[PDB]
Structure 1
Amino acid sequence: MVLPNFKENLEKYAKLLVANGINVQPGHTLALSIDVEQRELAHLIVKEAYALGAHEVIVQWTDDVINREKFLHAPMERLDNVPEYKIAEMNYLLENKASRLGVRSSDPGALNGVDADKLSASAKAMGLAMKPMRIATQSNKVSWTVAAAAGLEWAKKVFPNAASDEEAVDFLWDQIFKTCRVYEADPVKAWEEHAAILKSKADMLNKEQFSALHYTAPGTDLTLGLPKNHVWESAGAVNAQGEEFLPNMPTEEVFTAPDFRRADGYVTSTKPLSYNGNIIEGIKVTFKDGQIVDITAEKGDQVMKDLVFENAGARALGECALVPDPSPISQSGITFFNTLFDENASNHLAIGAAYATSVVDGAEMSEEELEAAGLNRSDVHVDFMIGSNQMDIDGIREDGTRVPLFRNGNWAN
């Protein structure tokens, strides 16, 4: 009743993810990563990928229940290293220049109750093992896309007051479809014009080349430097083959990397965060000389401290992203407990790695150059959100001039 024409819209969504998200070309290999619960969507994705000429789709199926049992019951020795066959699966994808479509539908609290040290050692072992792919991906060597599907446990958390499970799920798909423009009569046109409006804010920032940004809101007073020759990006990338693609659907942000060596001040998080299958609440961070010097959370405090102080590069920032508080996901009043959505509802920062493309010619830079360019290197990249309708930001020019950028959570003018 809340979601009429479901099957048709779902097929319309699948088509979008494949034609416009990844942009499948003849001869391509597609890796789809997706939850078993979402087989219906997976079938539609795979059909469309072959209809557009893919030579091969490989589906890597995930499942929260089974992943939780592994974490809960396997010994550390199965959890703290990556077996060779998984590395060999990754290399086959790399070898084939596989596009990577990731459809997220997991329970935000999927791994609640798992020992802290196993989540942490598994994420470290994987972050190190999967690095070649992250590197290839963070530099648009292949098309990649992150998108969502309405998992049942996720939907119950997003809408705890739903009249029933089905209603919770309908409401989530409805948000997915609306933010991905699936209801538009011409979604491609609509995506093109959404893209244009963000691209023009990004161009305006690329021209200013601010030296730093200063954020202010209650619980927040933070100054972040920006690298020399940084690129603000949004909605739309071009891969190392001339092909256009959408890295995130939905998306409402314009973003770049700060200079990882320059951060002072403090910041209060305004959204929860799902990290390692746990929900983290009430995060606060203090920065000094470019480094995290204290990190705290009302729930999940130990998860954050372990993120930050036990992975290299994680005491520094790799992304700063702007989203107007009046934009549609922020305005829906929904908290998603999910990074792809909540990050497109609110300004956000990332702990850990900078995308290579956040600096000019960054996609052909070595790790050494990227680092010297002021772009943080890390095996983790963990977005947390800091915007609100009370937030002001100024851009700071090279001569210290303060330019209003955001006022009360929206572009200043």
Structure 2
Amino acid sequence: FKENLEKYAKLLVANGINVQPGHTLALSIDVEQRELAHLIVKEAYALGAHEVIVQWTDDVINREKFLHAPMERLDNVPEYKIAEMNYLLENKASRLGVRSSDPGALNGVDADKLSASAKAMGLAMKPMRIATQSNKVSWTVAAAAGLEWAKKVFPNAASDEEAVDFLWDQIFKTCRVYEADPVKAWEEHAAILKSKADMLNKEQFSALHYTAPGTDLTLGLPKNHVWESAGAVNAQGEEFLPNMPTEEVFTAPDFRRADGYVTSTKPLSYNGNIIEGIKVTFKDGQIVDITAEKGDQVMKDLVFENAGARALGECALVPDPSPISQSGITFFNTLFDDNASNHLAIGAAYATSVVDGAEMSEEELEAAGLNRSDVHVDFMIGSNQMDIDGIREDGTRVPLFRNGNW
């Protein structure tokens, strides 16, 4: 364990945040993971950082503040937290966020108090959100095996230690830690993901044809679409990885081009429900029927009660042989569950899925063919029996996936 956890640490500061000499790093991490934090701080200074600032998190104590503090302490952000953000901004600090996800960490908390805080914080920390969204500084989101998440992922474990050990093992396996040189393994894997995206971006397929057991579906793609995966580059030219781990290569379909049907292959976790065996039927871009062996009404309510929820906003590729795909585990954490399999999203497209989408207007994205909606629900459809062809503007079929792989 101590050996693997130190390899994890090194992987996060080299491929995740790419610490260089001179750098300031802000690490956001649970007090429960103090051992991983010691290692991250040690590896960060060894790559030359001049300062690592640890912003320690604790679910029990933050829940206390939310229960008891008066609204006046929640909707006013104290000046010292803005000064802290300004220090980080001025030193171009990288943001490494290592999260363990317990979903009922805020049980009993009033939604209005949470919302008041999220609003006041959302405004006061906007300079930090702009810097990270626009990639001015490097940032990575990763995971750590906290007790309450681990009990949720492995509710049948023999004990709490076991639940925790099984979750660490998943994290090490899916982040390539058991490899002899994880740093190298991720450099190589990142270049492969980026060459898939680059290949599909040079193709500019007109449509995608998927066939599998319970699936036959043609989805058209928007003109000037962008496939994204893997890493980014920050404002100083440094290569970084926003997510550890990561597999998918995704774009937006044209929301007014869809015919056929598709069945889900992996449990979907949505609003506290586990939904199984979904089958979606499309005609003219639109969902005309949706069913599930489990959570039927939830799925209907989703599509036939939310604006924009009768169309797709995302199509994503992931080899079936890849590590999350091969786990068979529901993690209830998007970082992992949305890298599990080929998938499609009900609802909103990401703006960056078309060229210059970041600048376009709401009316303009619609024009470009990107779905707008307030919901966005990714559901897995891939398996070792899925085939996919890209369809060129002149109907020529180019094989992309056979039996669930490139």
Q: Distance in 1 between matches of 2:75 and 2:308?
A: 20
Cα drift, residue 69 of structure 1: 6.7
Q: Distance in 2 between matches of 1:352 and 1:132?
A: 28
Gaps of 5+ in 1: 1-5
| 1:7 to 1:260, Cα distance in 2 relative to 1, 3 A | same
With the length of structure 1 as denominator, give the TM-score of the two structures: 0.75
**Contact 1:120–1:307 under 8 Å retained in 2:** no
Cα drift, residue 296 of structure 1: 7.2
Q: Distance in 1 between matches of 2:15 and 2:300?
A: 38
Q: Distance in 2 between matches of 1:300 and 1:80?
A: 37
Deviation string for 1:355-385 (max 9, x for gaps)?
Answer: 5654446677788876655455677765442
Deviation string for 1:242-294 (max 9, x for gaps)?
Answer: 11112222222222333355445554443344556776666665666656677
Deviation string for 1:339-361 (max 9, x for gaps)?
Answer: 22233321123456655654446
Structure 2 partner of 1:28: 23
Deviation string for 1:150-171 (max 9, x for gaps)?
Answer: 1222223333343322122122
Deviation string for 1:171-206 (max 9, x for gaps)?
Answer: 221221222222233222222222333334333322
Deviation string for 1:11-59 (max 9, x for gaps)?
Answer: 2211210121011234444343333322322232234334444455444
Q: Distance in 2 between matches of 1:308 and 1:79?
A: 35
Cα drift, residue 207 of structure 1: 2.8
| 1:95 to 1:370, Cα distance in 2 relative to 1, 3 A | farther
**Contact 2:20–2:48 under 8 Å retained in 1:** yes
Q: Distance in 2 between matches of 1:301 and 1:77?
A: 43
| 1:135 to 1:259, Cα distance in 2 relative to 1, 3 A | farther
**Contact 1:139–1:355 under 8 Å retained in 2:** no
Structure 1 stretch displaced more, 376-385 or 332-341: 376-385
Cα drift, residue 101 of structure 1: 2.0
| 1:72 to 1:18, Cα distance in 2 relative to 1, 3 A | same
**Contact 1:108–1:278 under 8 Å retained in 2:** no
Structure 1 stretch displaced more, 260-269 or 303-312: 303-312
| 1:300 to 1:242, Cα distance in 2 relative to 1, 3 A | farther
**Contact 2:210–2:216 under 8 Å retained in 1:** yes
Deviation string for 1:48-80 (max 9, x for gaps)?
Answer: 334444455444444444566778899999999
Deviation string for 1:311-332 (max 9, x for gaps)?
Answer: 8877654432211112233223
Structure 1 stretch displaced more, 383-392 or 266-275: 266-275
Structure 1 stretch displaced more, 327-336 or 126-135: 126-135
**Contact 1:109–1:277 under 8 Å retained in 2:** no
Task: Give the number of equivalent residue pairs.
Answer: 406
Cα drift, residue 392 of structure 1: 3.0
| 1:43 to 1:296, Cα distance in 2 relative to 1, 3 A | farther
Corresponding residue SS for 1:404: strand
Q: Distance in 2 between matches of 1:364 and 1:388?
A: 36
Cα drift, residue 149 of structure 1: 0.9
* Residue number among 380, 383, 390 corresponding to 2:378 in the alignment: 383
**Contact 1:159–1:168 under 8 Å retained in 2:** yes
With the length of structure 2 as denominator, give the TM-score of the two structures: 0.76
Corresponding residue SS for 2:329: coil
Deviation string for 1:85-119 (max 9, x for gaps)?
Answer: 98887677566544332223113555678899999
Q: Distance in 2 between matches of 1:84 and 1:278?
A: 40
| 1:313 to 1:323, Cα distance in 2 relative to 1, 3 A | same
Corresponding residue SS for 2:104: coil
| 1:76 to 1:317, Cα distance in 2 relative to 1, 3 A | farther
Gaps of 5+ in 2: none
Q: Distance in 1 between matches of 2:278 and 2:116?
A: 22
Q: Distance in 2 between matches of 1:350 and 1:88?
A: 39
| 1:75 to 1:321, Cα distance in 2 relative to 1, 3 A | farther
